[PDB]
Amino acid sequence: LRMKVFEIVKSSTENEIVRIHVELPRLKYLKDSNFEEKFNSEVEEKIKKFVNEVKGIAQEDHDKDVQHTPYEAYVSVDVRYEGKDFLSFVVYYYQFTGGAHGITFFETYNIDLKNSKVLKLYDIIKEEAEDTIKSNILKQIEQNNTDFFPDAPMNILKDDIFSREFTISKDGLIIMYPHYDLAPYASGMPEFVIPWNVIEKFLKYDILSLLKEGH
Amino acid sequence: MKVFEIVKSSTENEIVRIHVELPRLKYLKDSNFEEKFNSEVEEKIKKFVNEVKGIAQQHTPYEAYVSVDVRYEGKDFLSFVVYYYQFTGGAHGITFFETYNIDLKNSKVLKLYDIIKEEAEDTIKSNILKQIEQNNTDFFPDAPMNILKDDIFSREFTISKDGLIIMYPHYDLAPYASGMPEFVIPWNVIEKFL
Question: What range(s) does the DUF3298 domain occupy (chain A) (predicted)?
Answer without folding.
Answer: 123-197
